[PDB]
Design a protein around this ligand. Structure first.
Ligand SMILES: CC1=NN(c2ccccc2)C(=O)C1
Ligand SMILES: [Cl-]
Ligand SMILES: [Cl-]
Ligand SMILES: [Cl-]
Length: 163
């Protein structure tokens, strides 16, 4: 565990993270995909051996000794708001279980079910609150990665609000 477990946000490519493991915003089929998933495939392609897993789950595959936690959030184009919310909360609970099991002191994590799984809705607050619900009982330093300047400010505000 970290001496003083924290949350931080950075606006940059999660493939360049400075943490002990990474969470991939994966598809259920273990395909290279697009966005974060494609960046993760280019950086850690070995971690996509037998990475397919159902929606609402996380599956860890090593790239050398570096753990890639493939977390599959729901695609809100396909799920109802209710069932999508339940699956999104579940994926983050499975990430917290894997982070704990691995014994890492830090993890790099994107906001699940934003971008192409958002069903065209702004889900910053929904996704980030599920992240906090799962990760608050863990003692890893959490570094959230985003690409948008306005999202950086909103995530930073939400972190600082609760300190
Ligand atoms: C930046 C981002 N904007 N969005 C977004 C998507 C739909 C509606 C509004 C906003 C993301 O998911 C990431
Ligand atoms: Cl970058
Ligand atoms: Cl997404
Ligand atoms: Cl973003």
């Amino acid at each position: 565990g970290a001496m003083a477990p924290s949350y931080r946000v950075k606006r940059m490519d999660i493939a360049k993270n400075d943490e002990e493991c990474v969470v991939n915003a994966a598809n259920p089929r273990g395909l290279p995909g697009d966005g974060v998933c494609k960046a993760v495939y280019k950086k850690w392609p070995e971690s996509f051996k037998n990475s397919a897993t159902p929606v609402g789950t996380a599956k860890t595959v090593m790239c050398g000794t570096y753990p890639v936690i493939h977390a599959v959030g729901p695609n809100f184009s396909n799920y109802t708001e209710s069932e999508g919310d339940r699956e999104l909360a579940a994926a983050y609970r499975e990430v917290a279980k894997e982070v704990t099991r691995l014994g890492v002191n830090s993890v790099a994590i994107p906001l699940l079910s934003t971008g192409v799984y958002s069903g065209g809705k702004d889900r910053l607050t929904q996704s980030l609150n599920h992240l906090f619900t799962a990760m608050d009982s863990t003692d890893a330093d959490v570094v959230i990665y985003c690409r948008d300047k306005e999202w950086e400010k909103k995530i930073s505000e939400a972190i600082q609000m609760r300190t």
